[PDB]
């Protein structure tokens, strides 16, 4: 594998700061240009500043946005690259990535963190199960699902239950409704089981809970 | 400084075909252009750098191509896994700017969605209020309508509706459609219909619970 793997994301209120680290690992990090990226929910692809390699030094470019605001530093004993972000904005939420090569033929592009600027105070999710109703419906594959409702920043994942029998879990993108967020994720699975086994959905949202909820009835 | 330009957004081709998206550039890159892959989760691929080489690893049926201003990128024979965003970016001149990006979805046989409509669950109710949740799971095409009527009425207030991104095993897409309401307003009714109107029918394809049933 050649690893990197973005890890500073969460939410910071407007006008603080946080630090982002890009963890690599299988080539010789020094080697290469290590650049900072983020896309903006919308929004097209933003470069935000790169730093060269050993052979060049390692020195910095960064884009007039950003210059003076955000520095990009690199440990090259840990092999950890780093972006410090300073009087953070609103505007400045997106999705961030870091990347090995930016000129070509060696890049890899980590998955992103996200962070949230913003002035609202966390707010973990109010998760409910859904059943059919009871007489009313069914036929062979049962759909349940769940709702996880008024949780804030994002992301949350739904876990199930994994055997492949069915299981067409669907996961429908949180949307954003009266300043909170609300996910839906729904199973559907073979008759033979629900109602005879059980199935839980398990809701994880990092800023601090996992509630797990069962299908009854 | 430069920018990119991605006309069209989205693109739908069925896999067998030879698929072109162009990117154009306001001034003159020389060349300096790569073209990215991004799924629907994170990852972000390069697939072409200076117009026309191929990163290791990218499929030959991907070609890219253009000068001065003007480029492309081509898939010979669209295969399922190219479902994507495609996007272009300019590194001849700092800062790097990409492309808006080119969505391609897979055209597929119509699919007929599977309606599924739950009541509130005892915990919700217990605290305050009631939503009526609607899966209308795993059609093609994308465009399709729901509406909600309670006891007969269409409702405006209280709708939440999203989408999946395409299937990337079989290339429908589901939706869920939420109305919320309080415990009280929810008492007083009775039946709860979710209307959907898609390509696949005349009529609108309904389920509905009459909360008196159960």
Same mark, same amino acid.
């Given at each position: 594998?050649? $690893?990197?793997?973005?890890?500073?994301?969460?939410?910071?209120?407007?006008?603080?700061?946080?630090?982002?680290?890009?963890?690599?690992?299988?080539?010789?990090?020094?080697?290469?240009?290590?650049?900072?990226?983020?896309?903006?929910?919308? $929004?097209?692809?933003?470069?935000?500043?790169?730093?060269?390699? $050993?052979?060049?030094?390692?020195?910095?470019?960064?884009?007039?946005?950003?210059?003076?605001?955000?520095?990009?530093?690199?440990?090259?004993?840990?092999?950890?690259?780093?972006?410090?972000?300073?009087?953070?904005?609103?505007?400045?939420?997106?999705?961030?990535?870091?990347?090995?090569?930016?000129?070509?033929?060696?890049?890899?592009?980590?998955?992103?963190?996200?962070?949230?600027?913003?002035?609202? $105070?966390?707010?973990?999710?109010?998760?409910?199960?859904?059943?059919?109703?009871?007489?009313?419906?069914?036929?062979?594959?049962?759909?349940?699902?769940?709702?996880?409702?008024?949780?804030?920043?994002?992301?949350?994942?739904?876990?199930?239950?994994?055997?492949?029998?069915?299981?067409?879990?669907?996961?429908?993108?949180?949307?954003?409704?009266?300043?909170?967020?609300?996910?839906?994720?729904?199973?559907?699975?073979?008759?033979?089981?629900?109602?005879?086994?059980?199935?839980?959905?398990?809701?994880?949202?990092?800023?601090?809970?996992?509630?797990?909820?069962?299908?009854?009835? | 400084?430069? /920018?990119?330009? /991605?006309?069209?957004?989205?693109?739908?081709?069925? %896999?067998?075909?030879?698929?072109?998206?162009?990117? !154009?550039?306001? /001034?003159? #890159?020389?060349?300096? %252009?790569?073209?990215?892959?991004? &799924?629907?989760?994170?990852?972000?691929?390069?697939? #072409?750098?200076?117009?026309? !080489?191929?990163?290791?690893?990218?499929?030959? !049926?991907?070609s890219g191509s253009g000068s001065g201003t003007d480029y492309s990128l081509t898939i010979s024979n669209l295969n399922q896994e190219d479902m994507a965003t495609y996007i272009?970016? /300019?590194?001849?001149? %700092?800062?790097?700017?990409?492309? +808006?990006?080119?969505?391609?979805? #897979? &055209? !597929?046989?119509?699919?007929?969605?599977?309606?599924? #409509?739950?009541?509130?669950?005892?915990?919700?109710?217990?605290?305050?209020?009631?939503?009526?949740?609607?899966?209308?799971?795993?059609?093609?095409?994308? =465009?399709?309508?729901?509406?909600?009527?309670?006891?007969? +009425?269409?409702?405006?207030?209280?709708? %939440?509706?999203?989408?999946?991104?395409? =299937?990337?095993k079989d290339s429908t897409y589901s939706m869920s459609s939420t109305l919320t309401l309080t415990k009280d307003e929810y008492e007083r009714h009775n039946?709860?219909?979710?209307?959907?109107?898609? &390509?696949?029918?005349?009529?609108?394809?309904? &389920?509905?619970?009459?909360?008196?049933?159960?």
């Open positions: 594998e050649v $690893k990197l793997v973005e890890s500073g994301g969460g939410l910071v209120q407007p006008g603080g700061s946080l630090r982002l680290s890009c963890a690599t690992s299988g080539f010789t990090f020094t080697d290469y240009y290590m650049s900072w990226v983020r896309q903006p929910p919308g $929004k097209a692809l933003e470069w935000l500043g790169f730093i060269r390699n $050993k052979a060049d030094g390692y020195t910095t470019e960064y884009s007039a946005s950003v210059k003076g605001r955000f520095t990009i530093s690199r440990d090259n004993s840990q092999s950890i690259l780093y972006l410090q972000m300073n009087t953070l904005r609103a505007e400045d939420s997106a999705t961030y990535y870091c990347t090995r090569d930016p000129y070509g033929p060696a890049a890899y592009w980590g998955q992103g963190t996200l962070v949230t600027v913003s002035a609202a $105070k966390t707010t973990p999710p109010s998760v409910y199960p859904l059943a059919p109703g009871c007489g009313d419906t069914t036929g062979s594959s049962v759909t349940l699902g769940c709702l996880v409702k008024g949780y804030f920043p994002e992301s949350v994942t739904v876990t199930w239950n994994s055997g492949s029998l069915s299981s067409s879990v669907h996961t429908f993108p949180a949307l954003l409704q009266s300043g909170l967020y609300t996910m839906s994720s729904s199973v559907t699975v073979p008759s033979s089981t629900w109602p005879s086994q059980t199935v839980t959905c398990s809701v994880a949202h990092p800023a601090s809970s996992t509630t797990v909820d069962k299908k009854l009835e | 400084d430069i /920018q990119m330009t /991605q006309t069209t957004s989205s693109l739908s081709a069925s %896999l067998g075909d030879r698929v072109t998206i162009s990117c !154009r550039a306001s /001034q003159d #890159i020389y060349n300096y %252009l790569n073209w990215y892959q991004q &799924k629907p989760d994170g990852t972000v691929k390069l697939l #072409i750098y200076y117009t026309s !080489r191929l990163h290791s690893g990218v499929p030959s !049926r991907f272009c970016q /300019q590194g001849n001149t %700092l800062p790097f700017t990409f492309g +808006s990006g080119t969505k391609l979805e #897979i &055209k !597929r046989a119509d699919a007929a969605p599977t309606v599924s #409509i739950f009541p509130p669950s005892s915990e919700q109710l217990t605290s305050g209020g009631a939503s009526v949740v609607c899966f209308l799971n795993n059609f093609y095409p994308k =465009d399709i309508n729901v509406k909600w009527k309670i006891d007969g +009425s269409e409702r405006q207030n209280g709708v %939440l509706n999203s989408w999946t991104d395409q =299937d990337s039946s709860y219909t979710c209307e959907a109107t898609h &390509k696949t029918s005349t009529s609108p394809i309904v &389920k509905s619970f009459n909360r008196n049933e159960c």
